[PDB]
Structure formats: C-alpha cells, structure tokens
Amino acid sequence: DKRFLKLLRFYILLTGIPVAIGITLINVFIGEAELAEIPEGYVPEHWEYFKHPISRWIARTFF
C-alpha cells in the first residue's frame, strides 16, 4: 500500500510540477489579454475572442 501511494504521488508530480510552473510563468510574463473594441474593418481570428493565453492557444491549435 505504501509503495502504490508513493508511485501515485510521483507520477502525478512528474507532470503536475512542470504544469504548475508553466502556468505560473505564463501568467506572470505573458499575462492575459486586454478587452478592446474591434477596430473598424478588422476581422479577428476565431482565437482572438478569448482572454487567457492557454485558452487562446488551445483554440488556435486544436479547435
């Protein structure tokens, strides 16, 4: 039982720590988008309608 919990903890942290750090670095150094009016005669890409950089990247890459 002890070995399983240690293995479970290790593999969650194997990616959980890098993700937690990646999220923090994205939040601090890239930041969120700023809401703005659509400039006259401008056609935003479908992923420019979202605020958080990770959400924008998900929309641009997969959706």
Partner: protein, 98 residues
C-alpha cells in the same frame, strides 16, 4: 465420468516475485506494464487532461453571454427601455388566425 485434468492450484504472484505489481509473471514485463499505466493514466490523461479542461476556450459561450448581457442592460437602461420584453418576436411580423 471421463478423463479430465484436475483443477489447478491457485497461484500467488508474490511467492516468486515479492516486488510484483500484479501485472505480469515476468518481472521485467510487470514493471513496464506498471509504468505505462501510471505514466499515461496519471501523468498524461489525468494531469494534462485536467489542465486542458480547466482552460477550455469559453465552454458553450457562457462568458460571452454574460459580457453580452452587461452590454444590453447598460444600453436598455440608458434609453429607458425595459430590461426584457414579454414578447420574444416582434408582433408586427405575426399574423394571428381569424
């Protein structure tokens, strides 16, 4: 009434491999099976999958609708209009029977 093999003995994986993970009798295969389940099950699907779900781009327009409702409420109150009307459709485009 026949020639039949007796029922086999029940095997315990720990007797021959005390470090067995319960996946396979072969210790090398047993460890690799443990790793793929844990890496792909927990490190990938659960951790990245939860991250992916948390950052979905405005799932089902819920945030857009709130921003849109704020705009409509501001506009309709600045011009004395009702916040909401009982009719969904303009009655001038409806021809009642009779």
């Amino acid at each position: 009434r026949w020639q039949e093999d007796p029922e086999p003995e029940d095997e315990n994986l720990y007797e021959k491999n005390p470090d067995s993970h319960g996946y396979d009798k072969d210790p090398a295969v047993d460890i690799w099976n443990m790793r793929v389940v844990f890496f792909f099950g927990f490190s990938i699907v659960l951790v990245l999958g939860s991250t992916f779900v948390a950052y979905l781009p405005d799932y089902r327009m819920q945030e857009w609708a709130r921003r849109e409702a704020e705009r409509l409420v501001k506009y309709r109150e600045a011009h004395g209009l009702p916040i909401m009307e009982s009719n969904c459709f303009d009655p001038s485009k409806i021809q009642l029977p009779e």
